[PDB]
Amino acid sequence: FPRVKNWEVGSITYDTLSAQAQQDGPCTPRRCLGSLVFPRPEQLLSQARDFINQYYSSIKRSGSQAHEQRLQEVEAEVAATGTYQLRESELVFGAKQAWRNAPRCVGRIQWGKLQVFDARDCRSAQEMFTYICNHIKYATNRGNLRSAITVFPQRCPGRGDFRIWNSQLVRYAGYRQQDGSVRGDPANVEITELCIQHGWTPGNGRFDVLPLLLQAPDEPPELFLLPPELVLEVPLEHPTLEWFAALGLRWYALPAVSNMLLEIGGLEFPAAPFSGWYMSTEIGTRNLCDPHRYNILEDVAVCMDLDTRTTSSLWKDKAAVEINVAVLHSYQLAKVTIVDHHAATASFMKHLENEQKARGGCPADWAWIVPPISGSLTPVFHQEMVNYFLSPAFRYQPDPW
Amino acid sequence: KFPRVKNWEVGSITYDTLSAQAQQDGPCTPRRCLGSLVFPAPEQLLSQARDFINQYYSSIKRSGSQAHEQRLQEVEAEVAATGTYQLRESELVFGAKQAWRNAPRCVGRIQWGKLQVFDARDCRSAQEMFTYICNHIKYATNRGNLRSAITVFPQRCPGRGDFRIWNSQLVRYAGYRQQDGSVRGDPANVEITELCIQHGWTPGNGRFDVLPLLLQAPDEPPELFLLPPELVLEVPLEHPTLEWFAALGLRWYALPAVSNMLLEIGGLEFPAAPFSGWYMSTEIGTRNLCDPHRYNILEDVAVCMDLDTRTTSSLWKDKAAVEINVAVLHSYQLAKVTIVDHHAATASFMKHLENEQKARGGCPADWAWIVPPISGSLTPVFHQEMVNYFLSPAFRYQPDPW
Numbered sequence: 135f136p137r138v139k140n141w142e143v144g145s146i147t148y149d150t151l152s153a154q155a156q157q158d159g160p161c162t163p164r165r166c167l168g169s170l171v172f173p174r175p176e177q178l179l180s181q182a183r184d185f186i187n188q189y190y191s192s193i194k195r196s197g198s199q200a201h202e203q204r205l206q207e208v209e210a211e212v213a214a215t216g217t218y219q220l221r222e223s224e225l226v227f228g229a230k231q232a233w234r235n236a237p238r239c240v241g242r243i244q245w246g247k248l249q250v251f252d253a254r255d256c257r258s259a260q261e262m263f264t265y266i267c268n269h270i271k272y273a274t275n276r277g278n279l280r281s282a283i284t285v286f287p288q289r290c291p292g293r294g295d296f297r298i299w300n301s302q303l304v305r306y307a308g309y310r311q312q313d314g315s316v317r318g319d320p321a322n323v324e325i326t327e328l329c330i331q332h333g334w335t336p337g338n339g340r341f342d343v344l345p346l347l348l349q350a351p352d353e354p355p356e357l358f359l360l361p362p363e364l365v366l367e368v369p370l371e372h373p374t375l376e377w378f379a380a381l382g383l384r385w386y387a388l389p390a391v392s393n394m395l396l397e398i399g400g401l402e403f404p405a406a407p408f409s410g411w412y413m414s415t416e417i418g419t420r421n422l423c424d425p426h427r428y429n430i431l432e433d434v435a436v437c438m439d440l441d442t443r444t445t446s447s448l449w450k451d452k453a454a455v456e457i458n459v460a461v462l463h464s465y466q467l468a469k470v471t472i473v474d475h476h477a478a479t480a481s482f483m484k485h486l487e488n489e490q491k492a493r494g495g496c497p498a499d500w501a502w503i504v505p506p507i508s509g510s511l512t513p514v515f516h517q518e519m520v521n522y523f524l525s526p527a528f529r530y531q532p533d534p535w
Numbered sequence: 536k537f538p539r540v541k542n543w544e545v546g547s548i549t550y551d552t553l554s555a556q557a558q559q560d561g562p563c564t565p566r567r568c569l570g571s572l573v574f575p576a577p578e579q580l581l582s583q584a585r586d587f588i589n590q591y592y593s594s595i596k597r598s599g600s601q602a603h604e605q606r607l608q609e610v611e612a613e614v615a616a617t618g619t620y621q622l623r624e625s626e627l628v629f630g631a632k633q634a635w636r637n638a639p640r641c642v643g644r645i646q647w648g649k650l651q652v653f654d655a656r657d658c659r660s661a662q663e664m665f666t667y668i669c670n671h672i673k674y675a676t677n678r679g680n681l682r683s684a685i686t687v688f689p690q691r692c693p694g695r696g697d698f699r700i701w702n703s704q705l706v707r708y709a710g711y712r713q714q715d716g717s718v719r720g721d722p723a724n725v726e727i728t729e730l731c732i733q734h735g736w737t738p739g740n741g742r743f744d745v746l747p748l749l750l751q752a753p754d755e756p757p758e759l760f761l762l763p764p765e766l767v768l769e770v771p772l773e774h775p776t777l778e779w780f781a782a783l784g785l786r787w788y789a790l791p792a793v794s795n796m797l798l799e800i801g802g803l804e805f806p807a808a809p810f811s812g813w814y815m816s817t818e819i820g821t822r823n824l825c826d827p828h829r830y831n832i833l834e835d836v837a838v839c840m841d842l843d844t845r846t847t848s849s850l851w852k853d854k855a856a857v858e859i860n861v862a863v864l865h866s867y868q869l870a871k872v873t874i875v876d877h878h879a880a881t882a883s884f885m886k887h888l889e890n891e892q893k894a895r896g897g898c899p900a901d902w903a904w905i906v907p908p909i910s911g912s913l914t915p916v917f918h919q920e921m922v923n924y925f926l927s928p929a930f931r932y933q934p935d936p937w
């Protein structure tokens with residue numbers, strides 16, 4: 135049982151929940167690989183059994199009546215069919231657990247408040263689009279964002295999978311050049327040239343919302359144009375830097391991850407988009423200032439008349455703070471839900487305290503919980519953390535092409 | 536099967552083959568990663584010794600030579616006759632540099648080859664220890680043009696207690712427990728402050744009172760030594776445009792000299808071997824001054840800046856911290872005392888990683904310690920996957936001698 139210390143307060147806890155760690159991680163006694171982004175059949179019944187036990191534990195209902203009853207049914211279902219179906223309440227329970235188990239998510243204080251749309255009877259990419267359109271409408275909610283997941287049919291042998299080829303439901307185009315440089319978002323150059331390959335008339339803008347490439351089983355993807363009124367965006371302005379608006383920056387309201395695989399009780403859902411609301415550093419620090427993303431830092435510094443000729447002026451740090459200010463200001467003025475990294479980390483510390491008493495610990499990935507600016511100014515920096523894998527879970531998966 | 540490592544800013548991919556040589560074991564398992572935790576027999580002495588001797592003879596292009604096997608035999612024979620062995624002077628220099636080179640938590644390692652090694656393994660007493668330490672401070676400080684150095688005191692050996700420096704650094708500010716339970720001065724130094732008083736030091740009552748040294752010779756109580764004031768170079772903190780900042784009365788010292796770590800070379804242990812370089816500005820401006828459990832000045836500065844401190848979304852904390860770090864950089868430059876900002880230091884560390892990939896096939900690095908505590912993703916090391924592991928020679932933590 136690893137001892138874990140908080141260095142701001144001096145308090146000590148023990149992560150006994152780590153003792154239940156499932157699939158192995160990438161680290162060994164000889165070397166730590168914790169900073170890497172991607173870590174390098176009656177088994178279905180062992181995973182389903184454990185998940186069923188998880189479910190009845192939470193509702194205080196282990197070891198009586200409906201517990202064993204549900205245990206025999208999954209056995210019989212897998213015996214007769216090779217797989218099984220989750221009850222709607224279990225699907226709801228599994229989706230919230232997978233979020234609760236996500237070591238890289240700093241917003242898990244919200245994990246109990248999640249709206250689950252059950253799309254396991256979807257039949258075509260046409261239907262997907264209507265589902266995705268329903269999700270976006272619900273989650274966006276005129277700017278009062280609501281956490282939501284839409285769960286499409288599970289993987290089954292013999293047939294292809296449902297897949298959303300985009301990494302997010304809302305992404306901006308990345309247009310290559312005669313000279314290699316990119317207009318738009320460099321992170322989406324690949325899917326941009328895919329969408330263009332499947333017939334999408336490209337734009338000429340820095341912030342063109344890409345179409346969706348949606349894949350029903352055993353069929354090639356189909357392009358769908360997202361209804362422009364369904365995509366809520368926020369023009370970025372600064373509260374006092376009048377010229378900031380003239381930079382023409384914008385970002386969208388809804389962060390909806392559409393390329394991760396949801397795994398519950400041994401079942402796999404390769405199409406299960408989930409959405410919450412943004413922490414402001416995600417937009418203002420990573421999306422806008424990463425060198426391989428929009429890389430706007432020096433343009434803002436020039437406008438601020440900062441001395442970009444010496445690193446020790448801290449011009450980078452100054453421009454970054456004002457970009458993050460512009461993001462928070464713009465989203466608040468638009469009445470679109472957003473949370474700053476100070477508020478989010480303080481709530482995560484509360485979440486850790488809750489999870490200590492509820493489960494004996496919390497899987498947390500320090501490198502991803504600590505925000506990309508002002509790290510040691512937040513309480514999570516001074517909190518030791520233990521990282522490990524539990525099921526239900528959101529897993530990474532290969533791109534479908 | 537060597538770890539593949541990606542840089543996400545550029546797209547580069549390398550393989551850390553050096554990691555396959557990790558001489559000891561860390562805290563992680565395939566079950567769980569503990570990377571974020573702060574604190575993670577003749578035959579076995581011989582095999583450590585043999586490995587270090589192999590390293591040294593490789594470095595001087597004498598691998599497998601007459602002199603190489605001769606040294607191996609000399610060490611085998613001394614361990615059999617005495618239980619231990621003595622390093623040659625050139626082996627100690629090589630081993631101290633390698634220990635720095637191998638330190639996973641040091642972002643300053645582009646400098647590792649430029650290290651001045653003072654051999655004090657002949658030191659006899661705590662009074663001689665104090666004289667060696669004073670000369671280290673004088674050489675390293677160099678009137679503000681700082682020079683990296685280490686002074687190596689006698690090794691742990693059978694029959695005798697250890698040399699120990701009780702202070703965690705050679706220069707440290709007292710922390711006076713008080714009665715709100717509050718601390719005046721540096722809260723990190725409350726324990727050592729109380730030990731100094733208990734050992735005859737007449738305390739002060741300021742926030743920046745330089746501590747005396749508590750020096751321990753083999754099998755003796757520690758002995759208290761005051762640092763000659765003209766050896767301790769300090770920098771008053773001012774801000775280039777916020778003129779009220781000087782009235783805070785803040786100061787920091789020029790020389791970061793870690794004095795409580797253990798230096799291990801070929802199985803030999805040097806419990807006393809203080810080493811010093813020069814500061815990265817975030818160490819002072821962000822950690823020492825802004826940590827809630829250190830001087831904790833952030834809110835006071837933000838109030839003086841007229842920032843709105845009743846809402847987090849004003850980013851008042853971020854804005855005050857940036858100006859504190861500016862103050863440190865400006866003040867050390869004004870004083871002509873070496874200091875490196877977090878952008879230049881992380882840029883130089885990336886070149887070190889590239890140098891090391893060609894030289895050794897990798898580089899042990901602790902991502903959480905390498906990425907600066909402010910502006911993390913604005914520096915190139917944020918975007919660089921790293922592999923953490925333990926090579927020897929090495930600097931190691933050791934328990935406090937009390």
Ligand code: HEM
Pocket residue numbers: 229233236238239240241244248281282283394408409410411412413416473478502528
């Ligand atoms: C509601 C407010 C939420 C906030 C403030 C939030 C915040 C964050 C942040 C900042 C990250 C870091 C990822 C990055 O840097 O790109 C993250 C990761 C993650 N979040 Fe959340 N999130 C929220 C909702 C959700 C929901 C509703 C789910 C799932 C049901 C979820 C699942 C995840 C997962 C799986 C990751 C890991 C991403 C990856 O490894 O690629 N989050 N979250």
Ligand code: HEM
Pocket residue numbers: 635638640641642643644646650683684685810811812813814815818875880904930
């Ligand atoms: C010359 C310029 C140097 C710079 C800019 C530098 C920078 C740093 C920084 C920023 C840290 C993080 C520690 C903290 O946050 O408190 C560190 C750690 C460390 N440095 Fe360096 N350093 C330098 C010289 C040296 C030298 C000369 C040595 C040894 C000969 C050394 C060995 C170490 C070790 C062992 C650690 C780990 C300390 C610990 O974990 O307690 N450094 N360094």
Ligand SMILES: Cc1cc(N)nc(CCc2cc(CCCN(C)C)c(F)c(F)c2F)c1
Pocket residue numbers: 301389390391393408409410411412413416530
């Ligand atoms: C629901 C949600 C709310 C929120 N507030 N934030 C996120 C963040 C997810 C995310 C994860 C990653 C990691 C890799 C991505 N996949 C394609 C490999 C990103 F890079 C990224 F930009 C990104 F937004 C999700």
Ligand SMILES: Cc1cc(N)nc(CCc2cc(CCCN(C)C)c(F)c(F)c2F)c1
Pocket residue numbers: 643703791792793795810811812813814815818
């Ligand atoms: C030569 C050198 C140059 C430089 N630029 N920086 C350092 C910083 C070392 C350091 C390490 C730690 C880790 C904890 C171990 N200690 C408690 C025994 C500190 F806490 C600390 F304050 C501290 F300065 C050293």
Ligand SMILES: C[C@H](O)[C@H](O)[C@H]1CNc2nc(N)[nH]c(=O)c2N1
Pocket residue numbers: 169170171501502503543917918919920921
């Ligand atoms: C190389 C490094 O692991 C990589 O840049 C990680 C670091 N921490 C992160 N943390 C978050 N939240 N998101 C990220 O994309 C990353 N990237």
Ligand SMILES: C[C@H](O)[C@H](O)[C@H]1CNc2nc(N)[nH]c(=O)c2N1
Pocket residue numbers: 141515516517518519571572573903904905
């Ligand atoms: C708990 C956490 O590991 C701790 O605060 C670490 C994180 N990274 C650090 N990095 C550096 N350079 N110095 C530190 O003291 C720490 N502290």
Ligand SMILES: [Cl-]
Pocket residue numbers: 389416417421
């Ligand atoms: Cl994003």
Ligand SMILES: [Cl-]
Pocket residue numbers: 791818823
């Ligand atoms: Cl320090």
Ligand SMILES: [Gd]
Pocket residue numbers: none
């Ligand atoms: Gd102007």
Ligand SMILES: [Gd]
Pocket residue numbers: 776777778
């Ligand atoms: Gd002024």
Ligand SMILES: [Zn+2]
Pocket residue numbers: 161165166167168563564567568569570
């Ligand atoms: Zn690890």
